[PDB]
């Protein structure tokens, strides 16, 4: 339940930081924010996109050939009289 | 003979101003023995980036000898009469005072202006001086105390002048030149920004006799005889948090931005201070001790020690506490403390005031407690306030303050502010800057 204070032994570390009221909430959206964004999305696309892709083209082949299979073969009739 | 008729009958100060611009101040008392010193308007806050730390250099070579007297004169001249040379530089203020025999007011005069003017600067003396005050910064890095202070300026005027440090940078003191700190004090050390100051069994016209004699070379253009206002300072609320738990306890100090010397309010804030007090484990009235948060230090052992300060300065200040602790009692301390600083706001009592007054009142009288410190009030009020202030006049400041003007001050200047931050050694236990931002109101 109690933790802070017998955490970790730390040594010689300085951090620096302000009031939330002396700072923007949400800076540099365009010089910095999106930049990321993309950074993250390009280096992930490429490891999750394509398994999904292939699930999504068993889904399209296994749905249409289903449906084939529900067409008429000309060829069933065509010696019929 | 009341407390009353006391202050009416201590002797006035008396001020005089040269040609050149160069105050002089003194009260006379019947002392065979006297301090007299100049104060000067200087510091490490008129430093910059480049000549950091040069105020500092140069009290290194006040004493070490003039161009009329090298080092073993200077040196075996004052000694052999009993006097003693003593000098501090700070951030807004510097300091060079001779105590000995009123016998010797006038050679002393004579000595202390031949030490703001003619400064040696001994070429040799300072490449060894370099190596002295270099043995002092890291003397210095061990005072836990001091090191806090530092970083609670550091963060607090980041960005602006009161963020340095008096001694300076390594940088700096390894390359400063003989040219930096003669420039400093040409820069400096002017008679407008100075004051003669002497207190003691001596004539208020003797020493300013003296004083036409000694403290003359008079300026040409105004741009030697207008005292530069320093741009301002920007508080900043936030924290700087320099964690090492091989240290044995923590130091924490936590403050915000003051009014300045000039402001009335400071006398409702030094009341203020004197209702929290301070505390350290050898008070002998232990549990039983009139300030709430020392009585609780004491039940609960949250600290070694604690105290309030109202530091001041021209266009600001820092208004804060200061306490030591152990790893696993800091969380404990820092509540009681900004508790205690949510009460003052909200529910100060007059029964509270009138203890703190009475505690303010001796405490004013015990800082004119000999020459020195007396001397050390003229050249700091003139340098301060542009006058020296009576404690009758404290007092008639200090007697007008009530419950109701301590709660709205302290409301003013504390409730819902954003301090600033500075934690050293062992301190994982201190919670975030949110955490203690929300302590800050209501409690």
């Known amino acids: 339940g109690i933790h802070f204070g017998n955490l970790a032994r730390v040594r010689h570390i300085i951090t620096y930081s302000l009031s939330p009221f002396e700072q923007r909430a949400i800076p540099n959206i365009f010089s910095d924010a999106l930049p990321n964004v993309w950074r993250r999305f390009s280096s992930q696309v490429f490891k999750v996109a394509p398994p999904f892709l292939g699930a999504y083209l068993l889904y399209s082949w296994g749905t249409q050939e289903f449906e084939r299979l529900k067409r008429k073969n000309p060829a069933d009739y065509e010696n019929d009289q | ?443």
Not at chain 2, 145 to 151: I, K, L, M, Q, S
Not at chain 2, 232 to 240: A, L, P, V
Not at chain 2, 279 to 293: A, E
Request: contains cysteine; hydrophobic residues 40%; charged residues 25%.
């Open chain 2, 1 to 443: 003979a009341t407390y009353a008729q006391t202050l009416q009958n201590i002797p006035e100060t008396n001020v005089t101003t040269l040609d050149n611009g160069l105050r002089v101040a003194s009260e006379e008392s019947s002392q065979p023995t006297c301090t007299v010193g100049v104060w000067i308007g200087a510091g490490s806050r008129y430093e910059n980036e480049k000549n950091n730390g040069a105020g500092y250099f140069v009290e290194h070579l006040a004493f070490k000898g003039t161009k009329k007297r090298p080092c073993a004169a200077f040196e075996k001249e004052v000694e052999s009469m009993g006097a003693h040379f003593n000098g501090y530089t700070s951030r807004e203020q510097t300091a060079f005072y001779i105590k000995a025999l009123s016998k010797d007011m006038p050679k002393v005069v004579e000595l202390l202006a031949d030490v703001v003017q003619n400064c040696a600067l001994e070429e040799s003396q300072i490449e060894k001086e370099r190596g002295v005050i270099l043995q002092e910064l890291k003397e210095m890095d061990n005072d836990m105390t001091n090191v806090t202070f530092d970083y609670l300026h550091a963060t607090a005027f980041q960005g602006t002048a009161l963020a340095r440090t008096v001694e300076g940078t390594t940088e700096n003191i390894k390359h400063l030149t003989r040219a930096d700190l003669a420039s400093y004090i040409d820069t400096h050390f002017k008679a407008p920004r100075m004051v003669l100051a002497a207190a003691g069994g001596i004539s208020h016209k003797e020493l300013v006799d003296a004083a036409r004699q000694h403290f003359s070379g008079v300026s040409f253009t105004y741009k030697e005889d207008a005292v530069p206002i320093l741009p301002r300072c920007r508080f900043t609320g936030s924290e700087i948090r320099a964690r090492d738990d091989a240290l044995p306890v923590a130091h924490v100090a936590l403050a915000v931005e003051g009014p300045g010397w000039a402001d009335p309010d400071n006398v409702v804030l030094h009341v203020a201070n004197a209702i929290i007090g301070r505390y350290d484990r050898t008070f002998g009235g232990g549990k039983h001790l009139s300030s709430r948060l020392a009585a609780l230090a004491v039940e609960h052992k949250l600290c070694h020690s604690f105290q309030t300060f109202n530091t001041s300065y021209s266009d600001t200040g820092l208004f804060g506490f200061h306490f030591v602790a152990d790893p696993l009692s800091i969380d404990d301390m820092m509540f009681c403390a900004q508790g205690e600083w949510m009460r003052l706001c909200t529910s100060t009592t007059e029964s509270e005031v009138k203890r703190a007054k009475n505690h303010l009142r001796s405490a004013m009288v015990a800082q004119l407690d000999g020459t020195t410190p007396v001397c050390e009030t003229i050249g700091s009020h003139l340098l301060n306030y542009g006058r020296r202030i009576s404690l009758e006049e404290w007092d008639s400041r200090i007697s007008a303050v009530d419950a109701r003007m301590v709660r709205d001050v302290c409301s003013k200047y504390i409730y819902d502010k954003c301090p600033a931050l500075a934690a050293v050694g062992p301190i994982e236990q201190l919670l975030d800057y949110n955490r203690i931002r929300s302590g800050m109101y209501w409690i």
